Write an enzyme that holds these catalytic residues in place. Structure first.
Site, PDB file in Angstrom:
ATOM      1  N   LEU A  22       1.089  -1.531  -0.079  1.00 52.80           N
ATOM      2  CA  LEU A  22      -0.162  -0.061   0.159  1.00 52.80           C
ATOM      3  C   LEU A  22       0.960   1.417  -0.046  1.00 52.80           C
ATOM      4  O   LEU A  22       2.091   0.884   0.500  1.00 52.80           O
ATOM      5  CB  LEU A  22      -1.531  -0.090   1.167  1.00 52.80           C
ATOM      6  CG  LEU A  22      -2.202  -1.340   1.165  1.00 52.80           C
ATOM      7  CD1 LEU A  22      -2.740  -1.149   2.110  1.00 52.80           C
ATOM      8  CD2 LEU A  22      -2.651  -1.454   0.115  1.00 52.80           C
ATOM      9  N   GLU A  30      -8.298  -0.112   9.287  1.00 53.53           N
ATOM     10  CA  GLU A  30      -8.307  -0.109   7.908  1.00 53.53           C
ATOM     11  C   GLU A  30      -9.213  -1.769   7.205  1.00 53.53           C
ATOM     12  O   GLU A  30      -9.822  -2.226   6.601  1.00 53.53           O
ATOM     13  CB  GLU A  30      -7.964   1.044   7.854  1.00 53.53           C
ATOM     14  CG  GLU A  30      -8.977   1.879   5.761  1.00 53.53           C
ATOM     15  CD  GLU A  30      -8.865   0.439   4.266  1.00 53.53           C
ATOM     16  OE1 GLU A  30     -10.496   0.276   4.247  1.00 53.53           O
ATOM     17  OE2 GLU A  30      -8.424   0.132   4.102  1.00 53.53           O
TER      18      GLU A  30
HETATM   19  N1  LIG Z   1      -5.007  -0.187  -1.828  1.00 54.55           N
HETATM   20  C1  LIG Z   1      -6.358  -1.235  -2.052  1.00 54.55           C
HETATM   21  O1  LIG Z   1      -7.355  -1.217  -1.848  1.00 54.55           O
HETATM   22  C2  LIG Z   1      -5.431  -2.098  -2.790  1.00 54.55           C
HETATM   23  C3  LIG Z   1      -4.681  -2.447  -2.935  1.00 54.55           C
HETATM   24  N2  LIG Z   1      -3.394  -3.393  -4.039  1.00 54.55           N
HETATM   25  C4  LIG Z   1      -1.777  -2.730  -4.313  1.00 54.55           C
HETATM   26  O2  LIG Z   1      -2.409  -3.003  -6.005  1.00 54.55           O
HETATM   27  C5  LIG Z   1      -1.278  -3.954  -6.349  1.00 54.55           C
HETATM   28  C6  LIG Z   1      -1.488  -5.205  -7.225  1.00 54.55           C
HETATM   29  O3  LIG Z   1      -2.445  -4.690  -8.550  1.00 54.55           O
HETATM   30  P1  LIG Z   1      -2.142  -4.690  -9.831  1.00 54.55           P
HETATM   31  O4  LIG Z   1      -0.531  -4.472 -10.148  1.00 54.55           O
HETATM   32  O5  LIG Z   1      -3.341  -3.489 -10.082  1.00 54.55           O
HETATM   33  O6  LIG Z   1      -2.574  -5.705  -9.914  1.00 54.55           O
HETATM   34  P2  LIG Z   1      -3.247  -7.454  -9.879  1.00 54.55           P
HETATM   35  O7  LIG Z   1      -3.312  -7.653  -8.681  1.00 54.55           O
HETATM   36  O8  LIG Z   1      -4.538  -6.833 -10.761  1.00 54.55           O
HETATM   37  O9  LIG Z   1      -2.380  -8.459 -10.435  1.00 54.55           O
HETATM   38  C7  LIG Z   1      -2.506  -8.738 -12.047  1.00 54.55           C
HETATM   39  C8  LIG Z   1      -1.781  -9.972 -12.732  1.00 54.55           C
HETATM   40  O10 LIG Z   1      -3.238 -10.647 -12.443  1.00 54.55           O
HETATM   41  C9  LIG Z   1      -3.347 -11.483 -13.448  1.00 54.55           C
HETATM   42  N3  LIG Z   1      -4.997 -10.458 -14.269  1.00 54.55           N
HETATM   43  C10 LIG Z   1      -5.434  -9.314 -13.492  1.00 54.55           C
HETATM   44  N4  LIG Z   1      -6.633  -9.636 -14.150  1.00 54.55           N
HETATM   45  C11 LIG Z   1      -7.009 -10.329 -14.319  1.00 54.55           C
HETATM   46  C12 LIG Z   1      -7.752 -10.672 -15.144  1.00 54.55           C
HETATM   47  N5  LIG Z   1      -9.404 -10.410 -15.669  1.00 54.55           N
HETATM   48  N6  LIG Z   1      -8.337 -12.310 -15.721  1.00 54.55           N
HETATM   49  C13 LIG Z   1      -6.887 -13.038 -15.626  1.00 54.55           C
HETATM   50  N7  LIG Z   1      -5.719 -13.026 -15.052  1.00 54.55           N
HETATM   51  C14 LIG Z   1      -5.467 -11.049 -14.421  1.00 54.55           C
HETATM   52  C15 LIG Z   1      -2.823 -11.199 -14.740  1.00 54.55           C
HETATM   53  O11 LIG Z   1      -1.513 -12.281 -13.991  1.00 54.55           O
HETATM   54  P3  LIG Z   1      -1.510 -12.787 -15.234  1.00 54.55           P
HETATM   55  O12 LIG Z   1       0.308 -12.523 -16.301  1.00 54.55           O
HETATM   56  O13 LIG Z   1       0.163 -14.238 -14.846  1.00 54.55           O
HETATM   57  O14 LIG Z   1      -2.264 -13.383 -16.026  1.00 54.55           O
HETATM   58  C16 LIG Z   1      -1.377  -9.619 -13.964  1.00 54.55           C
HETATM   59  O15 LIG Z   1      -0.537  -9.404 -14.822  1.00 54.55           O
HETATM   60  C17 LIG Z   1       0.065  -3.955  -5.163  1.00 54.55           C
HETATM   61  O16 LIG Z   1       0.519  -2.851  -4.687  1.00 54.55           O
HETATM   62  C18 LIG Z   1      -1.246  -4.152  -4.076  1.00 54.55           C
HETATM   63  O17 LIG Z   1      -1.157  -4.409  -2.702  1.00 54.55           O
HETATM   64  C19 LIG Z   1      -4.176  -4.339  -4.470  1.00 54.55           C
HETATM   65  C20 LIG Z   1      -5.792  -4.367  -3.995  1.00 54.55           C
HETATM   66  C21 LIG Z   1      -6.874  -3.234  -3.587  1.00 54.55           C
HETATM   67  C1  LIG Z   2      -6.645  -5.036  -0.751  1.00 52.30           C
HETATM   68  C2  LIG Z   2      -7.802  -4.836   0.040  1.00 52.30           C
HETATM   69  C3  LIG Z   2      -6.297  -4.283   1.282  1.00 52.30           C
HETATM   70  S1  LIG Z   2      -4.094  -5.514   1.375  1.00 52.30           S
HETATM   71  C4  LIG Z   2      -4.549  -6.611   2.494  1.00 52.30           C
HETATM   72  C5  LIG Z   2      -3.603  -6.654   3.369  1.00 52.30           C
HETATM   73  C6  LIG Z   2      -3.746  -8.057   4.412  1.00 52.30           C
HETATM   74  C7  LIG Z   2      -4.304  -8.419   4.569  1.00 52.30           C
HETATM   75  O1  LIG Z   2      -4.782  -8.739   5.567  1.00 52.30           O
HETATM   76  C8  LIG Z   2      -5.038  -7.792   7.597  1.00 52.30           C
HETATM   77  F1  LIG Z   2      -5.286  -9.769   8.387  1.00 52.30           F
HETATM   78  F2  LIG Z   2      -6.425  -7.744   7.210  1.00 52.30           F
HETATM   79  F3  LIG Z   2      -3.399  -7.803   7.492  1.00 52.30           F
HETATM   80  C9  LIG Z   2      -5.691  -8.080   4.511  1.00 52.30           C
HETATM   81  C10 LIG Z   2      -5.995  -7.128   3.017  1.00 52.30           C
HETATM   82  S2  LIG Z   2      -6.032  -3.200   2.466  1.00 52.30           S
HETATM   83  C11 LIG Z   2      -7.569  -3.119   1.755  1.00 52.30           C
HETATM   84  N1  LIG Z   2      -8.490  -1.879   2.291  1.00 52.30           N
HETATM   85  C12 LIG Z   2      -9.541  -1.894   1.423  1.00 52.30           C
HETATM   86  N2  LIG Z   2     -10.709  -1.648   2.225  1.00 52.30           N
HETATM   87  N3  LIG Z   2      -9.959  -2.701   0.481  1.00 52.30           N
HETATM   88  C13 LIG Z   2      -9.166  -3.777  -0.376  1.00 52.30           C
HETATM   89  N4  LIG Z   2      -9.511  -3.707  -1.894  1.00 52.30           N
HETATM   90  C14 LIG Z   2      -8.250  -3.427   0.450  1.00 52.30           C
END
Ligand SMILES: NC(=O)C1=CN([C@@H]2O[C@H](COP(=O)(O)OP(=O)(O)OC[C@H]3O[C@@H](n4cnc5c(N)ncnc54)[C@H](OP(=O)(O)O)[C@@H]3O)[C@@H](O)[C@H]2O)C=CC1
Ligand SMILES: Cc1c(Sc2ccc(OC(F)(F)F)cc2)sc2nc(N)nc(N)c12
EC number: 1.5.1.3
Length: 186
Positions: A22, A30
């Site tokens: 993050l 959160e």
């Molecule tokens: N602040 C938040 O709420 C959230 C933060 N994060 C952060 O965001 C980042 C990770 O996100 P991001 O780069 O977007 O990566 P994703 O989690 O979307 O991973 C991308 C990989 O997933 C596979 N993929 C994605 N979409 C599809 C699909 N529709 N069908 C099949 N395969 C798919 C592909 O892998 P392949 O090449 O193997 O096909 C792609 O290279 C991290 O920094 C994580 O910490 C993630 C979630 C929520």
């Molecule tokens: C993916 C995500 C995160 S990353 C994360 C990392 C650790 C986790 O396990 C534990 F136990 F809560 F530490 C669960 C999720 S915070 C976040 N916030 C909101 N509102 N939406 C999202 N989608 C995400």
């Protein structure tokens, strides 16, 4: 199967990630909110399903994987089988949502929660149908290298209240944030 939902935390400059983690320091409440919203099912005998991309999977600390009490589905075209600890693998969002309707999941799964990352959110958000966005607004800019797609407010209405979701400003580690729920139906 019940509702389709996305959940995200996002800074003011639309950031969701940096270097596989993050953008901000850990906000313990959160994370508690994320676990509560994604785990809580109103339908007795069912669990919710979390859909994520492969980098999002690997971004969750190993001790927290799979996300407990949820069915965990990873999206990848490169992997040949679910990663260690995951339950399911699908090659596309549509494939995942289809699987949900198969007899092996159809009566098990209550809500579906997309939990990241950017491409999985963008496709969900731009596909017709009924969808909610649970967005935590982190109220500062943080350097990021992965971003939340644009929310079209013509289609996504910000709800003026939602049960189970606090409406006031939260603060942890000196960082203010707020919770929002959006709904579209198209
Ligand atoms: N602040 C938040 O709420 C959230 C933060 N994060 C952060 O965001 C980042 C990770 O996100 P991001 O780069 O977007 O990566 P994703 O989690 O979307 O991973 C991308 C990989 O997933 C596979 N993929 C994605 N979409 C599809 C699909 N529709 N069908 C099949 N395969 C798919 C592909 O892998 P392949 O090449 O193997 O096909 C792609 O290279 C991290 O920094 C994580 O910490 C993630 C979630 C929520
Ligand atoms: C993916 C995500 C995160 S990353 C994360 C990392 C650790 C986790 O396990 C534990 F136990 F809560 F530490 C669960 C999720 S915070 C976040 N916030 C909101 N509102 N939406 C999202 N989608 C995400």
């Amino acid at each position: 199967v019940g509702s389709l939902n996305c959940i995200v935390a996002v800074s003011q400059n639309m950031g969701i990630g940096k270097n596989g983690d993050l953008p901000w320091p850990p906000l313990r409440n959160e994370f508690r909110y994320f676990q509560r919203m994604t785990t809580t099912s109103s339908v007795e005998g069912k669990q919710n399903l979390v859909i994520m991309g492969k980098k999002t999977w690997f971004s969750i600390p190993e001790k927290n994987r799979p996300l407990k009490g949820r069915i965990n589905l990873v999206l990848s075209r490169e992997l040949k089988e679910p990663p260690q600890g995951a339950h399911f693998l699908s090659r596309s969002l549509d494939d995942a949502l289809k699987l949900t309707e198969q007899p092996e999941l159809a009566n098990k799964v209550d809500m579906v929660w997309i939990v990241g990352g950017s491409s999985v959110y963008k496709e969900a958000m731009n596909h017709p149908g009924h969808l909610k966005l649970f967005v935590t607004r982190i109220m500062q800019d943080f350097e990021s290298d992965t971003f939340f797609p644009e929310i079209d407010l013509e289609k996504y209405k910000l709800l003026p209240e939602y049960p189970g979701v606090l409406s006031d400003v939260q603060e942890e580690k000196g960082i203010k944030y707020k919770f929002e729920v959006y709904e579209k139906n198209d």
